[PDB]
Amino acid sequence: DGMIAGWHGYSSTGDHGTKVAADLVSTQKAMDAITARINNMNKMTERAFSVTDSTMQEIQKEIKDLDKKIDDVRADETAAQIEMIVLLENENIINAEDEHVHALKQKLTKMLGPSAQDMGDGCFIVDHQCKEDCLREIVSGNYTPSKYGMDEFKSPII
C-alpha cells in the first residue's frame, strides 16, 4: 500500500488488478515526527551549563584521578542514556506506523459510507469499480459515495 511516492498510501485490488496511490500528508507527518524525535536526541550533547574552575594537570595524582573519575562517570552514564533513548525512540517510531495506518483506516471508514464492509485489516469492500480516480479522491479527501451509486450516511434530521 503506497510508495507511488511516499511511505503511506492506499490501494485498490480487483477486476483491474492492483492500483496504488499515496497520501503524502500522513507520510510527511511521519517524517516530521521522526525528525522531531531526532531533534530531541541532539540536546543530550548540550547538557553542560555551568563552567567551574578546571583542575589543572601536573598536580597531586589523587586530585588528577578524582577529576578524571568525574569525567569518566559522566561520560559512561551519558553513553548509556543515549543508547537507551535510541532504543526507545526506535520502538516509538515503529509503533507510530500502526498509529498512522489506524488513522488512514478511520479516514476510509468515514469516506466510504455505511455500506462498505470493514474487513478488520484496514480494507473495505465497495460494490463499484475503483480505478485510480477513486484513489485520487480518497487521498485528496473528496471521495463521495453517491458519485458511484453507493449509500451515504443517514442525515441527522428526522
Partner: protein
C-alpha cells in the same frame, strides 16, 4: 472493489535495535554515530582559543609572560578555550629560577585556564609596610628592559633594607586585592647564593627559613647556599645564585601569611583571573584552522552527527558525545 489502507513494502537496508521487537529490519535508517578524523588544532568558530598567552609579543615564552618579565609585558587576548601545549613551560629571560624545586612550573598553565587574565597595578604588599623601613627593589642586571637598562621582574621584588645580619624573622599578611569574582595569583620567593655572596648582600652565611600559610596549606623552605644546578632558563651567562619561588592563590575573603628571614623576595604585582574556560592538551594552533570542536585525541573536528564512536577524551566546543557502539534511527517503514 477492495480499498485498503496501510504502508508500502520495500527491501530492507538497515537493522535497528529496539526495546521489545529485537533487531527490526527497516528500509532506511539514519546513522547517529561517526568515526572522528584527526585535524589540526585551531579556533572554534564561536571565539578565540588562547594557545600562546601573549601571541603578539615575540621572543618571549608563556613562562616569561606569567612572570611579568620586563620585555614580555604585552596584551593577553581573551579566549573561550585554551590549549596546554607545554607540560613544563620554560623561562628564557631574567634571573634563573628553580622552577622544578617548587610549584611555579605550572603558573602559565593556571593563567590560561581563565577567560580574562588581568595584570593588577600595584604591589600586593607595599614597600612602605615592611619592617626594615627603607626597603627598595633592586635592579637585577640579568633582566634588561628594551634599551639594555637593568630592571626587575614585574611580579617579584628583590628586596633589601637598611641593615645586614641574621634576624629573628618578619611576618607579613597578604589579603585578596582583586574583584569579588576574581582569583588572585601571587608570586614570592627567596634569593639563594654562595655563602660569601649571601654574607655580602644580606649579612648571613647559612640557609634562611621561609614559611607561608595560604588556603592551599603550609609551605616551608630553607634554600641551600651553593652547589646550584647548572645554569638554564635565563638570559644570564653567569648568575652565581638562584631564585626559589612559591606560587600562592587567594579567592575573595581569603588571607595568607608569609614568615620570612633574610633573602626574601617579595610580591611585586599580581594576576587577577576572572571567568574559567575549558582547557585541553594538544599542539599549538594551525594558522587559519577553524573547527567546531577541539578534542584531545583528534585535533579540530566537525560534528556531522551528534554522537561519535572512537577514542574517548576531553573536548571543548560544539562536540559530539562518545558512545560505545553504532546507533541507527528508523527513517522509513518496517521491512517486509
Amino acid at each position: 472493489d477492495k480499498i485498503c489502507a496501510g504502508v508500502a513494502s520495500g527491501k530492507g537496508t538497515h537493522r535497528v535495535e529496539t526495546i521489545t521487537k529485537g533487531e527490526v529490519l527497516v528500509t532506511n535508517a539514519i546513522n547517529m554515530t561517526h568515526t572522528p578524523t584527526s585535524g589540526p588544532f585551531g579556533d572554534l568558530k564561536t571565539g578565540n582559543v588562547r594557545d600562546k598567552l601573549c601571541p603578539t609579543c615575540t621572543g618571549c615564552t608563556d613562562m616569561d609572560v606569567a612572570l611579568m618579565t620586563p620585555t614580555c609585558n604585552g596584551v593577553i587576548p581573551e579566549a573561550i578555550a585554551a590549549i596546554q601545549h607545554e607540560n613544563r613551560p620554560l623561562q628564557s629571560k631574567c634571573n634563573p629560577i628553580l622552577h622544578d624545586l617548587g610549584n611555579t612550573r605550572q603558573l602559565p598553565n593556571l593563567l590560561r585556564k581563565y577567560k580574562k587574565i588581568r595584570k593588577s597595578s600595584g604591589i600586593a604588599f607595599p614597600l612602605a609596610s615592611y619592617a626594615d623601613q627603607p626597603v627598595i627593589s633592586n635592579p637585577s642586571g640579568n633582566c634588561r628592559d628594551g634599551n639594555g637598562v637593568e630592571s626587575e621582574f614585574g611580579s617579584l621584588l628583590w628586596l633589601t633594607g637598611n641593615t645586614k645580619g641574621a634576624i629573628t624573622g618578619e611576618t607579613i599578611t597578604i589579603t585578596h586585592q582583586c574583584n569579588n569574582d576574581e582569583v588572585m595569583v601571587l608570586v614570592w620567593g627567596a634569593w639563594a647564593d654562595l655563602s660569601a655572596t649571601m654574607n655580602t648582600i644580606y649579612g648571613v652565611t647559612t640557609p634562611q627559613t621561609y614559611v607561608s600559610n595560604f588556603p592551599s596549606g603550609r609551605f616551608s623552605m630553607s634554600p641551600f647556599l651553593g652547589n646550584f644546578p647548572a645554569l638554564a632558563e635565563t638570559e644570564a651567562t653567569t648568575a652565581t645564585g638562584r631564585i626559589y619561588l612559591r606560587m600562592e592563590v587567594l579567592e575573595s575573603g581569603q588571607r595568607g601569611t608569609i614568615q620570612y628571614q633574610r633573602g626574601f623576595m617579595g610580591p611585586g604585582k599580581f594576576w587577577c583571573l576572572s571567568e574559567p574556560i575549558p582547557v585541553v592538551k594538544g599542539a599549538v594552533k594551525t594558522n587559519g584552522a577553524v573547527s567546531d570542536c577541539l578534542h584531545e585525541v583528534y585535533g579540530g573536528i566537525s560534528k556531522p552527527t551528534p554522537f561519535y564512536t572512537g577514542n574517548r577524551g576531553k573536548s571543548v566546543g560544539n562536540c559530539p558525545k562518545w558512545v560505545r557502539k553504532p546507533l541507527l534511527v528508523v527513517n522509513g517503514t518496517k521491512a517486509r
